[PDB]
Amino acid sequence: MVVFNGLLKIKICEAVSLKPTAWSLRDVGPRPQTFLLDPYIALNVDDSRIGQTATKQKTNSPAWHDEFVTDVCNGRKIELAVFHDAPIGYDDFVANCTIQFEELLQNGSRHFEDWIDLEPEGKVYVIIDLSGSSG
Ligand SMILES: [Mg+2]
């Protein structure tokens, strides 16, 4: 089990090697070119959206350095989901990663900082601090 009860502070610093999905690519060269996303990361705790970073224009290695602080009640996990900001309609899912509060609370806890692998591709650097208790 293991849940978190307290304040969660997370800084979504930057991502690298983001890969455009076939859908985001649907829109014809006509020359071998690299498609650049307009990415942002959505922060979800359990199944609730906490917020999202700003959208960066034309880059697959965005640097947001956006910080979020939220009160967590019986928190199970954090999900970071990268999206491509579409001009019209729903944004396109790009990649994601999930972090269980249980792994963050392992002896010592309170402060985590490192690169987290995104699925299918890429990685995001985050700084996570917890101020509460496990249970
Ligand atoms: Mg939008």
Side-chain angles (χ1 to χ4, degrees), residues 38 40 52 55 84-91:
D38 291 338
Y40 70 79
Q52 73 189 60
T55 293
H84 169 56
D85 205 325
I88 297 176
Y90 291 153
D91 298 327

Side-chain angles (χ1 to χ4, degrees), residues 13-27 29-32 34-130:
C13 304
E14 74 181 80
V16 299
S17 305
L18 292 182
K19 179 182 186 176
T21 58
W23 187 258
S24 291
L25 294 173
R26 73 179 189 290
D27 298 301
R31 275 289 172 64
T34 309
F35 180 71
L36 299 175
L37 302 160
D38 291 338
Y40 70 79
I41 276 181
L43 171 66
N44 302 315
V45 169
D46 287 352
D47 282 311
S48 294
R49 185 89 144 211
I50 299 306
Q52 73 189 60
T53 70
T55 293
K56 304 321 287 283
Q57 296 274 65
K58 297 177 176 178
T59 177
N60 297 335
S61 279
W64 299 285
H65 296 297
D66 285 315
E67 175 167 275
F68 305 75
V69 172
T70 186
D71 237 298
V72 181
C73 297
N74 289 157
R76 255 67 66 177
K77 89 299 193 65
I78 299 171
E79 172 193 41
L80 301 179
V82 178
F83 287 85
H84 169 56
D85 205 325
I88 297 176
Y90 291 153
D91 298 327
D92 306 317
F93 176 74
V94 177
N96 74 331
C97 67
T98 302
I99 301 73
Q100 306 293 311
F101 280 104
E102 188 179 333
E103 56 195 308
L104 292 169
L105 292 167
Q106 292 304 314
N107 280 53
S109 72
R110 308 308 164 186
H111 185 76
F112 172 73
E113 203 189 308
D114 213 317
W115 290 96
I116 301 184
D117 289 341
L118 293 171
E119 288 306 315
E121 292 190 58
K123 66 181 186 176
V124 60
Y125 191 81
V126 304
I127 304 182
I128 299 169
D129 287 278
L130 305 177

